[PDB]
Amino acid sequence: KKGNYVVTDH
Amino acid sequence: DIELTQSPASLSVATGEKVTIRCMTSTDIDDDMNWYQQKPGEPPKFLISEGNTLRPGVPSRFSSSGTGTDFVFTIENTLSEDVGDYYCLQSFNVPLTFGCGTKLEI
Amino acid sequence: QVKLQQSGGGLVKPGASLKLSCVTSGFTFRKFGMSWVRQTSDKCLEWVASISTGGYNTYYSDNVKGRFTISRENAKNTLYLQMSSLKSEDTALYYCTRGYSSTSYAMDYWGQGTTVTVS
Secondary structure (H helix, E strand, O other), X not given: OEOOXXXXXX | OOOEEEEOOEEEXXXXXXXXXXXXXXXXXXXXXXXXXXXXXXXXXXXXXXXXEEOOOOXXXXXXXXXXXXXXXXXXXXXXXXXXXXXXXXXXXXXXXXXXXXXXXX | OOEEEEEOOEEEOOOOOEEEEEEEEOOOHHHOXXXXXXXXXXXXXXXXXXXXXXXXXXXXXXXXXXXXXXXXEHHHOEEEEEEOOOOHHHOEEEEEEEEOOOOXXXXXXXXXXXXXXXX
């Protein structure tokens, strides 16, 4: 998570 | 929506000369600036990622710098194989946005 | 070694649909986010959509919201772009792309590009 988006889910 | 504007739109250099290409953003991007080189009939090739760092395998004659909204890409000692279109990309925020390229000829 | 293999696309009339496929190999697909970005004839690149590792988070450009859907099938190492209500403005070479880090959609590997023409 960084900026305004997620690329790695949990 | 962060807008990226590249300059010059195109340039022609002689072999062994330095090229300087700029990409300015409309707002801060936390140094998440990326640079690509695209040759005819191929996808863009990743040269520089976030934090102005050269990708492994890319020639050390390529460099980038800048922070805030003002970023630079340079080729020291340009070679004929560097002909192509160079693109900047911010990856700080979605929508991810690109400049529309600087055309390089030797 | 990382390979993004594209297929689908073509020429369709306005209002039509098209599903683009991108099959990946050479890495654990579920550990990476993926995106589609398109290149128009003016050579400008425009991000279309991004999807997180498991598919729980998706992001779309305002230009394709309500018409395109990005999805992935992790067991098949495949990324998809379902296009519907296509318009001439969507004519472009579409690229499959991998986000280079666990936190960024900045692209490292790109597929070979799929032509879609809407006319």
